[PDB]
Every structure is written in C-alpha cells, then in structure tokens.
C-alpha cells in the first residue's frame, strides 16, 4: 500500500494537510514491507531443504511400487500437484499492489520433485550428507525394522505391500478429484486476505463526519480555511482504517509464520528421515512421507503401517 | 533441553548430519549453540542382496547389510564399511529361500562345526 | 536515482539490497472541461429586481433552470448587505453545475435578518421559516426599506414549511405585522435564499465555461461537469441505460461517464502509476544502481538497457543468460555486480546431479568427518518503560 | 460484544451518527467471533485425540 | 430469518453453519414521568418586572426554589433581545428539573 495515495489520492492540499501527522505513513509502509519480506523467508525455509537438485532414473524398477502419479511430468508438475492447483478458485487500482513471490511455482514444483527423487532413491541419507543409493525394497526393509517389525516380514510380503501402496495412492487421487472442500485450510487464508483488502477498499466511501466522501468534491466547492477541517476529518478516518488493516495483517502474518515453521519441521523430520513421534506424521507407525506443492502451501502424503486382524493368546 | 542434556534423534534439528553432542555459549542478548555432528564421507559402491540361500533356508542379516566386492559376500553395518565373514552368529533365518525376490546363492559358516573336529 | 536512497534511509552509505524509494505517476496535461450545450443567460433580474415580495406567512419561491447563470456578476457587488454562502465558495459557483435552483424571497426585519439560518432560534426561526440540518446555496439579504418605508405580516414548524392560515387560536389571534417608516430595530430588509442540489440528476444551470474539445486514450485531467477527475479515457464494450449518467464499481470512484453534449459513454481508468525500486550493490563496493518500475510495461517510461520481467520493467541491468546463485532478490524468478555492470538472471536452485540407481547396488561410506555448526537464537529484548 | 449497543446504548440518533463511520463494528464483531470459534477448536484438538 | 442471513452475508446463497444476524430487545411501551407533587408557580415577574437593578459594582443576585416553574411564558415572547443558553436548549427547559 501507499499511504499518501490511498489517503489523499493525488491532492497536493491533502498531502500538505497530512504531512503534519508525523511519519505514520513511513511506519505503516515499513511494517507491510517487513511481512512481505518475511513471506519469502517462510517459503525458502519450508521448501529449500535440499542442497542439490536430485533427479530420477529413467528405469523405474522400485520393487513394484508405482510412483507415476507423484513424480513430475515433463509438461511442467505431477498429476497430484495439478489436481491440487485446480482445487483452488482464487488488484492494483488505487495505492494498492500485489508483489509477486520470489520463487515461481515452477521452482517450487522443482524443489518438491528434487526432494521426492532423493527420498525414493537414497532414503535417510541425502538429508545427512551425500546420497547413497539403495534398492527401494531394502530401504523399505530398513524402515520396517525401524518401526519394530523384522525385515523378513517385508521380503516375504513385498507384493502385497506394493499392491496396498498402489491402491492407497489411487484412493488419494480419487478423494482429491471428487470431494469438495479439500484445501479449506488454504482457501480460508486466501478468503481472509481478500476480505481484509476488500474492507480496506470499501472504507473509502465513508464521511467520518465530513460533508462528503470524495476529496476533490470538497476541494471543488469550498475555501481552504474551511476545507481544512473537512479534509482533516477524512484524513484521520482513513488513517485509522489503514492502521487497523496493518495491525490485523501483522497478527495474521505471525500466525502464518508459526504454521510455516511447523511445516518446515515436518519436512525436516518426516521427509528427510523417519519420525518416531506418535501421531506426528499420520495415524499409525510412520514409514515414509512424500511432499507435494500447492497453490499457497504444501501437502504431505504420509505412508504409515497399521496392524489388523489380531488374535488373542495366553501370556506369561 | 533436547540437544545439550541428551542426544536428539530428530533429523536436521541440531545440525546437518548425525547428532553427537552440543555445547552452548552465552551471547549479548541470546544464545549460540555449537553442534558437534558426524558426517560420513568417501563412499564406495558394492553389490547387494536381500537374503542368502543356504541348503533350502533363507538367511537375513541380524544388524547390517550383505555386501559384495564382486567376488565374495560380507556383512557390514549400514553406516560404515567394516566387513566380516558371513556366519550364523550374525544372520538369523526364516523360511525357505524360494520367495524372496533377488536371493543370491552363497555359503554361511557355522563356528560350531569346525570345533567338532 | 541513488540519492533518493541516501535520503529515504537518512544515511550516506547504504548496504546491498533492494529498497522502495518512492512512487511514480505519469502526470496529466491539457486539462479539459465538458459542460452542457445550452448557453443562455439566466434572468436573475426578474428575481432580485422585483418589488412585490410576499410577507413572512406566504414567502414566495420560484424555480430556475435551463440556462447558464453568471454568478460573479452579483456576488462581487456592494448592492447586498448579507451575502453568506453555506457549504459553497461564492467565488467558485462559476465552475459547479446544478440540477435546479430554488430562489425563495420574502421581507423581514433587519434585526431578525440573522434568524434565517440553520442552527438559530427565535421568532421566525421557530414559527415562520427554517432551514434543515444541511446547507442551502446562499443567503442574500439587502436593505430595501428605501422602497418599503404593516402590509408585511408574520406569526414548531419544520424546515421549508408554509403556514397559510391566519386564524385566531383562550381567544387570541397570533399573527402580527411590521412597520415601514424611516424612524433601527424594525427597519426592514428584503431577503432571498438560493438552494441547490449536487450530483442527483443531470445538471442544467452553471456559469460561463469554455467546454473545450475532447481527448481519448490519454492520461488527462478533466473538469467533467462539476465532477473533476484524472485518468485515461477509453471506449467501452459495456452500454448504459437511457437513465444512466455515470457509473462505478466500488469505493465512490467514477469509472464511466456519458457525455453531456454527445450522449456518448466513455470509460475512465487510472493511468499508469506504480512504485519504483532501486537495486544497489552497496555503496562501499561501487556507486552504480539499477532501477525497476513495479507492475509497469515500459512503453510508458531512462531506457539505456531495458528488460521486461514478470515483476515490472528493469532498467540499468543486463539480462544475462547463465544462471548463478541469487545475490539480490527481485521477484518472480529473477535475482540480481559482475563485470563492471549489474546483471539480472534467473536464479538456479543448485547443482543438478542424478544418483546412479540400480536394484542390486548399494553405497556405503568408508571414512567420516566430524563437524561443528553454529546456531544463534535470541532469547530477550530490552525492558523499555 | 455488540458495537451499536455498547457505544450508543439504544439511541436512534447515535446509530444514525455512527453509520457514517464505515463498518468498523462489523469488523470488530467478525474478529471476536473468529477468536471464539478458535477457542472452540483448541479444545477440540487437545481432548478429542 | 433466512432473508436476514442472506442480507448479513451479502449473498443470495449461504452454506451450512450458524451465523449471528442481529441482536434483539423487547421494546418498551407507555413511558412514565414522575416529578414532585409540589406545584405552585413562583414569581419570575418579581425578578424581571423591576427597576432597582443594581449597577455592575454590586450586581444583585437572588435565589429561586420550591416551585413548579414556567419558562415558556418568558422565552416565547418578543420582549428580550439576546436569549443565549450555554449548554441547554431553551425549548427543552420544560422537561428539566434543577
């Protein structure tokens, strides 16, 4: 926002009348640019967790697992990221502007593919040093042994686990394509930001006690000695409105920063490794996680192992 | 609380690598942690296998991985190269070796048999 | 361009980065005026130069429309005693157009001439005449006892209310009369009030303006029939209705307007404005500086080396081809001192390698290195009181 | 909290003189209901595990 | 009520949930007024209809109480010139107790 232009609107008389209010304009500009610069820090702390842009090998022999619907397509971006970008249904007129993000969605969709290609091909290692290749079934056996179940239980059941993983990826793709209100946690943020800007722009049709709500009108049909007080009323009202907007934006940006911190920690500890924290990444025992880009956030797909069909035994 | 008083197993929470220890330091208006971490280097590539066929049984490692430098099979820890002869004291066994996808044939020693002679 | 940084940051040396120094707006020129066609003088003489003005009980009112009204030929004269305009500047009425004009006229005392005003109490203010909690055009009261010095009579009523009954209202008739004689407290004054309306209908009455020619597709300043504005005028696919004089979307700003002389509808849009931002490599290193106009197509402006990016237009920096690490962020995939100039590239995310993956090969380390990494965290701020 | 009743107190002329201040009160009401719904979500997230 | 929702949400359609449309208050009826019983007019004439108004050295002052007053019979006339009440509206003085 530009305070001298939102408030006055290219009226030198109003500019002179407002210059006597200290440096409120510079302070609001400073706060807004602070949060605008903090958003890019949020993004680079969540996504730029990798050192090199790993790549996936053309031969896909990952022990029978189908990573086709999460790995990127040479069109851009994966299939699930495209479904996500479709699941959301998102100006510059008077002193307002929308800066672009530093990282285009292409670069974010490239980061979330480097991470995925490194997770499928090396496992825990690429987050702790160099990438040490390992066949996928052996990495999955390491993970099973990590959750407390011996490795032979995988090698005896490789086909069934591959089939269950494929059917679960299908389930997720369907539950995304069909159901409404999927990304409500992002549509909510977009709606809140847009409604705040809408209230700000609509607060320009108020009189606050003046004779009119347009400044050039009072400028036209009145004398400076009297125009002073009407312009002052409009000025103090518009200043109060701009200040309210800035403060609520500060609070909301602090909340968004906390959420991006949570997401950065979840990326560092569930994608780069295997979390032993209960119900931190999914319901059940954690095996692995795959990240996915989004319109204005991130989507984790946690693969977990859940026991079933239990029996009763006598113990000692 | 979780890096100075103990050893965190959380990835990239207290360094870049595997956490060994941490030392705190005071500051003008804050704190400065110095995380001591362990990072592997000078990797080498070997041939691998999930199990081993031996007289109709499938032998899986106990702690480590089966490796081969082209000729003969050893067992190592997954984080360092320290090879050892494949014996029965470090490879358990479960089931007949027709099911596991990619079993290699090899020999598994039994340190009791030579002591019998 | 650099000095604005040294002024916005109140310093003689500024570090690297990208600062916001000011805005820019293409200032308009050749202001136009667009007033109606009908240009004939209005007969105020048949209003102010009358002699038969009714009393305070049936104070007269006449309407005025369908002409052009010279106001600076009356306001600047010594012929009136009280010429007080409420809400309008008397020297400006030759730029504002009105929809109608209501000239009310009567004859009252010279002492009670002060009670014709909104916010005053008294006899006629409460029983004969009143004005609402709003403005009228002006009050014009002139001493006319020379041509007057009984036949003038006067009595909870509302603003602009008429009491025609003269009946006794405990038998007492309330009405009373004046005295016309050159004998100060009762010397009569002939008083009129002019009432206007603003921006409620098509206007017909206003002063001698030029109604200059029209322009199109240019950031111009217009005085469009009392509605003053600035912007670029374009043609509309949209169409108004026979009962539409102007339009708007949100926030009271006029977005479209029909002509008063040609009935043609034009669209009004804000002409190219934006912010300016100066990318500097730091004053201790050098003194050259690049500049970027936010959300601007630089078909509207120096232009020594121009690069149009998704963030705006960038002048002073050369678009280099090979990606490097990000030095100074610009936005939308661009990041920007190398080889005596400033360069603007597309930043890259890192080295692009591909691990050799096979279903029977593994990689195991043989050596190791222990490292120490620092991490700083603030725990307190200053305890201001 | 209700704006038109806290600050005016059932006075028609006060409501008329207040309508000219934009929609400050609707915005405050919105903020307060937001934090109320959040205070509900807090318990919903802590206890319904 | 549904119209009040569609009006409060600036939309002709509204999803599920529970909204706050307005307040509500039972409006009072049959207003009452309770002034003291002592109703015997007091002589403002013995104040205004006099000639011994002392000069501005010892400008006289008197007290008035214990009556139902009558303020219209004075204000409504054309007898005086300046009638400027600081903080009170004259046409209201017939509803205020002092």
Swiss-Prot record, chain A:
Sites where a glycan is attached: 66, 312
Record annotation: effect of changing residue 220 to A: In strain: Alpha/B.1.1.7
Annotated site (Cleavage): 77-78
Start and end residues of each stretch annotated as Heptad repeat 1: 158-208
Disulfide linkage: 3-25, 8-14, 270-281
Outcome after substituting residue 265 to I: In strain: Gamma/P.1
Coiled coil: 187-231
Free-text function comment from the UniProt entry: Precursor of the fusion protein processed in the biosynthesis of the S protein and the formation of virus particle. Mediates fusion of the virion and cellular membranes by functioning as a class I viral fusion protein. Contains two viral fusion peptides that are unmasked after cleavage. The S2/S2' cleavage occurs during virus entry at the cell membrane by host TMPRSS2 or during endocytosis by host CSTL.
Protein name: Spike protein S2
Native source species: Severe acute respiratory syndrome coronavirus 2 (2019-nCoV)
Classification of source organism: Viruses, Riboviria, Orthornavirae, Pisuviricota, Pisoniviricetes
Gene assigned in the entry: S
Portion held of the full protein: 736 to 1078 of 1273
Curated annotation (Swiss-Prot), chain B:
Impact reported for residue 42 to H: In strain: Kappa/B.1.617.1
Cystine connections: 3-14, 53-97
Glycosylation: residue positions: 45, 69, 105
Consequence of changing residue 72 to Y: In strain: Theta/P.3
Organism domain of life: Viruses
Protein purpose: Subunit of the fusion protein that is processed upon entry into the host cell. Mediates fusion of the virion and cellular membranes by functioning as a class I viral fusion protein. Contains a viral fusion peptide that is unmasked after S2 cleavage. This cleavage can occur at the cell membrane by host TMPRSS2 or during endocytosis by host CSTL. In either case, this triggers an extensive and irreversible conformational change that leads to fusion of the viral envelope with the cellular cytoplasmic membrane, releasing viral genomic RNA into the host cell cytoplasm.
Protein name: Spike protein S2'
Species assigned in the record: Severe acute respiratory syndrome coronavirus 2 (2019-nCoV)
Shown part of the complete sequence: 1030 to 1146 of 1273
Swiss-Prot record, chain D:
Top-rank taxon, per record: Viruses
Cystine crosslinks: 3-25, 8-14
Function: Precursor of the fusion protein processed in the biosynthesis of the S protein and the formation of virus particle. Mediates fusion of the virion and cellular membranes by functioning as a class I viral fusion protein. Contains two viral fusion peptides that are unmasked after cleavage. The S2/S2' cleavage occurs during virus entry at the cell membrane by host TMPRSS2 or during endocytosis by host CSTL.
Name of the protein described by the UniProt record: Spike protein S2
Provenance organism: Severe acute respiratory syndrome coronavirus 2
Residues of the full protein shown: 736 to 784 of 1273
């Amino acid at each position: 926002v530009d305070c001298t232009m939102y408030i006055c609107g290219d009226s030198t008389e109003c500019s002179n009348l407002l210059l006597q209010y200290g440096s409120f304009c510079t302070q609001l500009n400073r706060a807004l640019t602070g949060i605008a610069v903090e958003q890019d820090k949020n993004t680079q702390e969540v996504f730029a967790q990798v050192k090199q842009i790993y790549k996936t090998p053309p031969i896909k022999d990952f022990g029978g697992f189908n990573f086709s619907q999460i790995l990127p397509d040479p069109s851009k971006r994966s299939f699930i990221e495209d479904l996500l970008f479709n699941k959301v249904t998102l100006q510059k007129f008077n002193g307002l502007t929308v800066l672009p993000p530093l990282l285009t969605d292409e670069m974010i969709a490239q980061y979330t593919s480097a991470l995925l290609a490194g997770t499928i091909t090396s496992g825990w290692t690429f987050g702790a040093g160099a990438a040490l290749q390992i066949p996928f079934a052996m990495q999955m056996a390491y993970r099973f042994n990590g959750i407390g179940v011996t490795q032979n239980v995988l090698y005896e059941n490789q086909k069934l686990i591959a089939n269950q993983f494929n059917s679960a990826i299908g389930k997720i793709q369907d539950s995304l394509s069909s159901t409404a209100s999927a990304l409500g946690k992002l549509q909510d943020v977009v709606n809140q930001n847009a409604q705040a800007l809408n209230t700000l722009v609509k607060q320009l049709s108020s009189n606050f006690g003046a004779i009119s709500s347009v400044l050039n009108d009072i400028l036209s049909r009145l004398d400076p000695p009297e125009a002073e007080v009407q312009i002052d009323r409009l000025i103090t009202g518009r200043l109060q409105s701009l200040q309210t907007y800035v403060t609520q934006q500060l609070i909301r940006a602090a909340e968004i920063r906390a959420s991006a911190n949570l997401a950065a920690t979840k990326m560092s500890e569930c994608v780069l490794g295997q979390s032993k924290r209960v119900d931190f990444c999914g319901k059940g025992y954690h095996l692995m996680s795959f990240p996915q880009s989004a319109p204005h956030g991130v989507v984790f797909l946690h693969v977990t192992y859940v026991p079933a069909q239990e029996k009763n035994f006598t113990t000692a | 609380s979780e890096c100075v008083l103990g050893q965190s197993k959380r990835v990239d929470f207290c360094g870049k690598g595997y956490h060994l220890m941490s030392f705190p330091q005071s500051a003008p208006h804050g704190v400065v942690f110095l995380h001591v971490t362990y990072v592997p280097a000078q990797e080498k590539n070997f041939t691998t296998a999930p199990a081993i066929c031996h007289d109709g049984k499938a032998h899986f490692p106990r702690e480590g991985v089966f490796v081969s430098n082209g000729t003969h099979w050893f067992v190592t820890q997954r984080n360092f190269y320290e090879p050892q002869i494949i014996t029965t004291d470090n490879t358990f066994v479960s089931g007949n070796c027709d099911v596991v996808i990619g079993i290699v044939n090899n020999t598994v020693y039994d340190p009791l048999q030579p002591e019998l002679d | 361009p650099l000095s604005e940084t040294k002024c916005t940051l109140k310093s003689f040396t500024v570090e690297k980065g990208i600062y916001q120094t000011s805005n820019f707006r293409v200032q308009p020129t050749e202001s136009i005026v667009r007033f109606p066609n009908i240009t004939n003088l209005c007969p105020f003489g048949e209003v102010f130069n009358a002699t038969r003005f009714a009393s305070v009980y049936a104070w007269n009112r006449k309407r005025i429309s369908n002409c052009v009204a010279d106001y600076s030929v009356l306001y600047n004269s010594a012929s009136f005693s009280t010429f007080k305009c409420y809400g309008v500047s008397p020297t400006k009425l030759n730029d504002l157009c009105f929809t109608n004009v209501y000239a009310d006229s009567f004859v009252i005392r010279g002492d009670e001439v002060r009670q014709i005003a909104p916010g005053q109490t008294g006899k006629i203010a409460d029983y004969n005449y009143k004005l609402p909690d709003d403005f009228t055009g002006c009050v014009i009261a002139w001493n006319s006892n020379n041509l007057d010095s009984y036949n003038y009579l006067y009595r909870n009523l509302k603003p602009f209310e008429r009491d025609i009954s003269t009946e006794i209202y405990n038998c007492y008739f309330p009405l009373q009369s004046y005295g016309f004689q050159p004998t100060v407290g009762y010397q009569p004054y002939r008083v009129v009030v002019l009432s206007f309306e603003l921006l409620h209908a098509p206007a017909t009455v206003c002063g001698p303006k030029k109604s200059t020619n029209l322009v199109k597709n240019k950031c111009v300043n217009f005085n469009f029939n009392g509605l003053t504005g600035t912007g670029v005028l374009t043609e509309s696919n949209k169409k108004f209705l026979p009962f539409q004089q102007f339009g708007r979307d949100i926030a009271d700003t006029t977005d479209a307007v029909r002509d008063p002389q040609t009935l043609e509808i034009l669209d009004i849009t804000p002409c190219s404005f934006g912010g300016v931002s100066v990318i500097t490599p730091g004053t201790n290193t050098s003194n050259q500086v690049a500049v970027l106009y936010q959300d601007v197509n630089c078909t509207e402006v120096t232009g020594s080396n121009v690069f149009q990016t998704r963030a705006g237009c960038l002048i002073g920096a050369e678009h280099v081809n090979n990606s490097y690490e990000c030095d100074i962020p610009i936005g939308a995939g661009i990041c920007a001192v190398a080889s005596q100039s400033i360069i603007a590239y597309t930043m890259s995310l890192g080295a692009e390698n591909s691990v050799a993956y096979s279903n029977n090969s593994i990689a195991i380390p043989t050596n190791f290195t222990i490292s120490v990494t620092t991490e700083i965290l603030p725990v307190s701020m200053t305890k201001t009181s």
